[PDB]
Design a protein around this ligand. Sequence first.
Ligand SMILES: Nc1c(S(=O)(=O)O)cc2c(c1O)C(=O)c1ccccc1C2=O
Ligand SMILES: Nc1c(S(=O)(=O)O)cc2c(c1O)C(=O)c1ccccc1C2=O
Ligand SMILES: O=P(O)(O)OC[C@H]1O[C@](O)(COP(=O)(O)O)[C@@H](O)[C@@H]1O
Ligand SMILES: O=P(O)(O)OC[C@H]1O[C@](O)(COP(=O)(O)O)[C@@H](O)[C@@H]1O
Ligand SMILES: O=P(O)(O)OC[C@H]1O[C@](O)(COP(=O)(O)O)[C@@H](O)[C@@H]1O
Ligand SMILES: O=P(O)(O)OC[C@H]1O[C@](O)(COP(=O)(O)O)[C@@H](O)[C@@H]1O
Ligand SMILES: O=C([O-])C(=O)[O-]
Ligand SMILES: O=C([O-])C(=O)[O-]
Ligand SMILES: O=C([O-])C(=O)[O-]
Ligand SMILES: O=C([O-])C(=O)[O-]
Ligand SMILES: [K+]
Ligand SMILES: [K+]
Ligand SMILES: [K+]
Ligand SMILES: [K+]
Ligand SMILES: [Mg+2]
Ligand SMILES: [Mg+2]
Ligand SMILES: [Mg+2]
Ligand SMILES: [Mg+2]
Lengths: 425, 424, 436, 418
Amino acid sequence: GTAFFQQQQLPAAMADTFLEHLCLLDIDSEPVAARSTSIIATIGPASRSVERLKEMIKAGMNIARLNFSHGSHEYHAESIANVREAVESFAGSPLSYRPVAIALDTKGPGSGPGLSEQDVRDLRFGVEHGVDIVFASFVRKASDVAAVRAALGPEGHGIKIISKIENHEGVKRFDEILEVSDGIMVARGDLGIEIPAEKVFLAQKMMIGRCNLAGKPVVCATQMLESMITKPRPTRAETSDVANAVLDGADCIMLSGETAKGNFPVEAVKMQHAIAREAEAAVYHRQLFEELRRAAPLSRDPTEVTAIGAVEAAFKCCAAAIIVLTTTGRSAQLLSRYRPRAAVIAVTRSAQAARQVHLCRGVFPLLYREPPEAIWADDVDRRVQFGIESGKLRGFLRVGDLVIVVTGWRPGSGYTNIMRVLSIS
Amino acid sequence: ELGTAFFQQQQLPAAMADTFLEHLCLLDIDSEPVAARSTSIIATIGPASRSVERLKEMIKAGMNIARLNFSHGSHEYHAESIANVREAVESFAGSPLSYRPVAIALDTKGPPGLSEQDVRDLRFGVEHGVDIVFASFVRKASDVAAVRAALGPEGHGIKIISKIENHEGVKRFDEILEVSDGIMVARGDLGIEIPAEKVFLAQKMMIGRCNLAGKPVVCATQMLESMITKPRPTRAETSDVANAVLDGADCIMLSGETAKGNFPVEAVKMQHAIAREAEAAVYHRQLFEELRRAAPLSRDPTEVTAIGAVEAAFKCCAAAIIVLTTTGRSAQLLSRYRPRAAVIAVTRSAQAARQVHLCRGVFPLLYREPPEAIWADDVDRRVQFGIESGKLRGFLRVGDLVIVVTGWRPGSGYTNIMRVLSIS
Amino acid sequence: RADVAQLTQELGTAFFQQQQLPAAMADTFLEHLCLLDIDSEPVAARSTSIIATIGPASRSVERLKEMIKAGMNIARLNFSHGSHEYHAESIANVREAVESFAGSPLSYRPVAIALDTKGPGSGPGLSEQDVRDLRFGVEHGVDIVFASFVRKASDVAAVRAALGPEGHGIKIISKIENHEGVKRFDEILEVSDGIMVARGDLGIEIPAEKVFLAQKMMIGRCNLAGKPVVCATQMLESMITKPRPTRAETSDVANAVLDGADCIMLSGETAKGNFPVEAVKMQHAIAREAEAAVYHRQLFEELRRAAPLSRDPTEVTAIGAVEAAFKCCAAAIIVLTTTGRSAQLLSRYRPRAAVIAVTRSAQAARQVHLCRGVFPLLYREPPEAIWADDVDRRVQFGIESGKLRGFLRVGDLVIVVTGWRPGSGYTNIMRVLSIS
Amino acid sequence: QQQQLPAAMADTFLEHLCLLDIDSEPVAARSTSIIATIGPASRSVERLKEMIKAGMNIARLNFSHGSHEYHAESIANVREAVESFAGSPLSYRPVAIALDTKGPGSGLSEQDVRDLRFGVEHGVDIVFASFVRKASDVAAVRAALGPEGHGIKIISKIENHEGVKRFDEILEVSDGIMVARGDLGIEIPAEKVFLAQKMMIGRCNLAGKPVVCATQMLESMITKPRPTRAETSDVANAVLDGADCIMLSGETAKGNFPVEAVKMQHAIAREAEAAVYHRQLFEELRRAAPLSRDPTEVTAIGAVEAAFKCCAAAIIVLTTTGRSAQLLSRYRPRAAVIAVTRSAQAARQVHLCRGVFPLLYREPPEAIWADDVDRRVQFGIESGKLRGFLRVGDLVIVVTGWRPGSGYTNIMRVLSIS
Ligand SMILES: Nc1c(S(=O)(=O)O)cc2c(c1O)C(=O)c1ccccc1C2=O
Ligand SMILES: Nc1c(S(=O)(=O)O)cc2c(c1O)C(=O)c1ccccc1C2=O
Ligand SMILES: O=P(O)(O)OC[C@H]1O[C@](O)(COP(=O)(O)O)[C@@H](O)[C@@H]1O
Ligand SMILES: O=P(O)(O)OC[C@H]1O[C@](O)(COP(=O)(O)O)[C@@H](O)[C@@H]1O
Ligand SMILES: O=P(O)(O)OC[C@H]1O[C@](O)(COP(=O)(O)O)[C@@H](O)[C@@H]1O
Ligand SMILES: O=P(O)(O)OC[C@H]1O[C@](O)(COP(=O)(O)O)[C@@H](O)[C@@H]1O
Ligand SMILES: O=C([O-])C(=O)[O-]
Ligand SMILES: O=C([O-])C(=O)[O-]
Ligand SMILES: O=C([O-])C(=O)[O-]
Ligand SMILES: O=C([O-])C(=O)[O-]
Ligand SMILES: [K+]
Ligand SMILES: [K+]
Ligand SMILES: [K+]
Ligand SMILES: [K+]
Ligand SMILES: [Mg+2]
Ligand SMILES: [Mg+2]
Ligand SMILES: [Mg+2]
Ligand SMILES: [Mg+2]
């Protein structure tokens, strides 16, 4: 239909140049797709009430951040329990249940060179309480990431380490840090004090670009909607900053004081949600996909090979979604690195992977709870049908849509190799 | 890894260039072609190439399609030539490393409508089971419809390749291509009907439009003309063959060179050698991107699977794309995106195996095994047949990655699956 | 590597590490972002003009001199506040601070005066207060009018009519502040001299989360049209009370420049805030960093591809001069202009080289601040007897001022743009000159 | 529209090919120079006048055949036919004389030393040096031309594997290259010659140096009045590849249709030049060309950019050595490069550069240098109007210098005709 091609900035998406793409942006072209940039909300006095956390989950919060710079272990354990109670209050309806990751933001090394003793204790607290992510403060070199990894012990092997770049050394040693990290956070607060304030945008745009190239998650953080701590609406610079972080290529956007201590935690989440949807439709996918494809090296890994085939197939038919079965989240992450316009619906039995895939843009995790079928092929199909039924319920899919389905040839992680074109019935 | 030697062969340094100009500068005469020759060779069978023994040598040299020119000879003469082609083709039906399907194409004499002789010759083609018709002097869409009507109740599966030989056919090209299975740039008559210095424009335009439409295009006439009397061609002749391949031609043709000349086998060998060199020199980076950008969005799962499979093949430098096809359509749709990987088409149809030679880079395998009771097993047996033939022919080695294209249920029109397999 | 090797041996590796030059030679926009370096220092003069609102915090002659030194190019007078007497006093103070540096072209900095109208309130047509304020502007010789709440082409015709016969030279920058203005944008831009993305009212008239789409669309269309575009409101809002801005604020300023804005504006930051000079200095520092981070390779190619073929010799000379400037990394393009038009046409192709515009018109010297990368040099000398010698004196004046201000260095290449006959509209010559 | 303008505005090379129209007639003058070998079939003064009218720009004398006396007679006949049109200076066409050496066979041969000395004594403009295989071979040819031999342009013939492999070092010291396909097709596999041709043409286009495509281009025309389909295709593809010159050997030296072979190359080259995809070509030439601090190089790119912006009918350039015209030519403008020169040798040698139309200025010098320049520019305009290049209302780009003498080009002006 003609109405379909007027929505989600589709006239601007078919432009032959970036300049004509900008000229074709339409304030009346309403976003159609689900919001793909994850929202991280920092927990605190303003957002710990189980009833308030349910409202923030409904507003769009995907990751709950625990700032270990404030509060005791007892306070953070209560935070975790309240988060989990609000999240599990929706588990009764599996087709609409939203997983929410728990991220521990460390205090940092302070005037020291290595892992502080408080960080060692907080990291072990995280492992004991099953946190999904660590936002490691003031990472300056690859050895800092190794020390965080060592402090998590043998039972914290699955925890994702997102390195916070907050100073000149972190920016200069970026490549070595990214190589050993699961992802990066552009921690603009400290970075804006450590380097000239007028240079932060260069560091942000560089790090987002390099993470997009590496296929690793990147978070844009601090003062995104700062004025919303006290005011019900943000400034023009604030909405622009959120939209530009999304247009830059950020996988996640973050709220600090806006959700931890402010008077508008639910409204700050709703504002980030509304801006991110508008900004994602305004992404010039033609140039982005082409540049991601050209820059990505050749690969002999069947997961990586299937992912680019599926993203290409998804673009060819305007697929509403790419449904992928995943154990660790990796197959969904490899689909995500090519920035498809189609939503990546990731079906998994791992509650931890379902939480952690929120770090990857455009990945919508679905927690599958059923015990395995006796016939593996039937078990794979029930999970694909679960993705279709959830997608229909959530508005991602309709009858007649085309979907790309990504599976593997055998059980277990690391064997994704099949891409199938499916029509929604 | 694949090794430094791997990335110096088949013009791979020139393939990674960021501009077409840089790509030309990086072409290396020492960079040897490794992939199998993907542009099919059509050889005209006449007095100089009719014998069963000569035909076996032409098949070994690379002939994929045998052309019978109905402007010369009689029905009896061409029936004997067809029988000799089939005898030479079936002489290799043992050793699978030598058995190659060979299509039979009937080139009509030409025309106020369809000529009485054309109606009789087209009827002869149906009775003798020809695979293709090269229809002479097609000027408009109604000319194709007349040839289509003459292919009668039994020959609707025969491919009609319209020969564009005059100003009217060039001007009415879009309407002709829409109703034809493919096109032949018949340069001989075209060079007399329009100024000789304009033929290259017509050739480049028609090849481009056929590539865009995803339909086969043949470059024909005087490609190696001097080889009718001389054992080696001129510098202009080898250049013409290489440039037809670089232009985007699916097939290249030999007329008098193989029908009446003194070096028919040498002419086939020469076209084979040039085509291999020219295919490695194709700038796939720009070609694939432009084919992709110009091709409209599709909701046909075969077309969607094909672009996914070609993208996947480039990503891992796949040795081949193995496709299961009954009519040849799934292989044709893979072929339109010009993959560097060979498209191994496994089929139970002898006709589809011969006809897919019209599509660049499609290597047909005719499968004769009895069907398995379980369809999923029958599919795996043909996929393994393609891998084993590929290993035997030199396309594949253990540890290689291949892309496998199949459908979700039996029958034609359901291709929707692309799998990345590691060769064991 | 080979398309920079000889110039790298000549100019040195240090030259090619500054002003984001490694990021500028990238083959993709993605590679360009990856190559951005916080240690790559900006070298070029700041090309995006700063508009500062003059009010209670920035009215004094002494404060205004500090603001001019900090980088203020255009003084905005908001006719929504104050009286005619109040704004006349502000204009006189701006002119006194500006003329305190008139002693030498090396210290002179021309500053435009812009009148921002109150608007039509609930009225469809021009308000009676606007008619009086517009006549005040003509009587006080303002250079620009920022016309509030423009909704259609007839609104700009009404503003033009209210300026009378003596306000023909005044530039009209239409403020787009509502849904109707955005929808009728093309018809408004066609009759306006430029546009202002008035985000404050626009953010109330349309959903706040859609303002960035309107800003990016309008900046793109103005860049395509070759007309000035201003990004305005809340750019450094927190600097009204704090000495440093938020991370969102510096990002917003950098992104307005990266979007293609010719001017950036400060409102309460300079009108009523505690850090007016610091707000101007902050916009100057961010704009210099953001201009070096512009991906000129894609920008110039896209401006070329989108611009139609032209038979106007000024337009033809401008693209030839911008192409020549990029080829040799020219330090500047010196252009002779009467109305500012030849400098504007150079400016639409976004050269990295500074456009030094030599003019005798004091008004054109002030108004060219609306065009990104145009540095106005007012020529005060009496005309020579021979026209060709007058032109050469003006060109040498640009070179000597450029050397003294640091734009030009010995060994640099400059591109010189002149005409064949006197008078406006005859630019047709481009010359490559080596600085000795 | 004419001259493949619908195909020229295409956004992709594929769509450009699809838009090629056999009814879109070429309008611009033929840019690719034709080199014709002068021999028994083309030696007469009367035959040479018809070859000049057919389009011959450079006369090649093959020193593998004939004697010094024979070639001197051929040179005299070429000069007599060329000067028969000098009465009308606005339409006179200069013709270069090129000496093709015999070669080294089994250093520089003693016969080559004598033939090169003959060339200097007879004022040849170009040397096509046979079997160049390294930079030292070019230096030997340069030495054999003596102190009174720097004026002659050395075009190195690449005819074997070593020449192809050491191409970059040969191109660096040569004025240009000839893809000598005859010997190259015997020295390397015949099916690889197209790779060597396309690589060498690309590298010469990148270097901004002339490249000639030679041998068997219209071979069948030695005995037949019309060429084969492969032959016309080969000529068109050499032009589409980026060749500055195309050559006729036996077709003009010993064949039954020498004038027809020249006419055929002229007709094909005009069609192929209009089918060049300038959008991609200019962008790639610009991107690949290095940054430069030379004002001639800087003015050249500015002028070519300005010409495309207004669809300029021509770029009129004043040149002493031909260098300013060569630097304009390397950017492949669609606009004709009309090179107004006082040097007769420069007017002949500039035929090696695609799209350069040489004009010999034979009017008296004006008193004011500034006045003298304007008359050389008006000369270009009057010749252009007479030859069909220009019409009243057209836009031209004029490339002049700031001071007399070679090496000072730095000015580009946009001028409206009449
Ligand atoms: N040139 C010719 C070609 S063609 O250009 O390759 O089409 C084909 C043929 C002949 C040609 O002369 C014959 O003489 C001939 C005689 C008797 C039976 C059959 C043929 C024949 O097929
Ligand atoms: N923010 C303000 C702005 S604006 O937002 O930058 O336009 C402008 C002004 C004021 C602001 O506070 C005043 O208080 C003011 C008082 C008395 C006379 C004139 C002004 C004035 O022009
Ligand atoms: O993204 P991961 O962790 O590699 O998971 C992909 C795996 O998921 C599957 O699709 C389903 O496997 P399971 O039945 O073990 O969940 C496998 O075939 C595939 O290897
Ligand atoms: O190219 P075609 O003619 O559509 O053939 C493709 C068909 O081949 C298959 O892959 C295998 O089908 P069969 O088992 O019937 O041969 C089908 O699933 C698919 O529809
Ligand atoms: O940019 P404008 O307004 O068209 O002015 C450019 C004009 O300036 C000049 O360079 C010099 O003109 P004047 O002698 O009138 O100052 C003209 O040749 C040219 O037409
Ligand atoms: O093309 P070349 O060899 O560099 O020389 C072109 C020369 O032509 C001029 O425009 C005019 O020079 P002349 O007075 O010597 O004819 C010079 O200014 C310029 O240096
Ligand atoms: O730690 C952070 O979030 C910061 O410094 O911005
Ligand atoms: O019929 C043909 O093949 C021709 O005319 O070239
Ligand atoms: O008028 C203004 O400046 C605004 O609305 O932002
Ligand atoms: O010498 C030549 O010209 C050749 O061999 O092609
Ligand atoms: K912290
Ligand atoms: K025939
Ligand atoms: K106002
Ligand atoms: K010779
Ligand atoms: Mg911090
Ligand atoms: Mg014919
Ligand atoms: Mg307003
Ligand atoms: Mg030779």
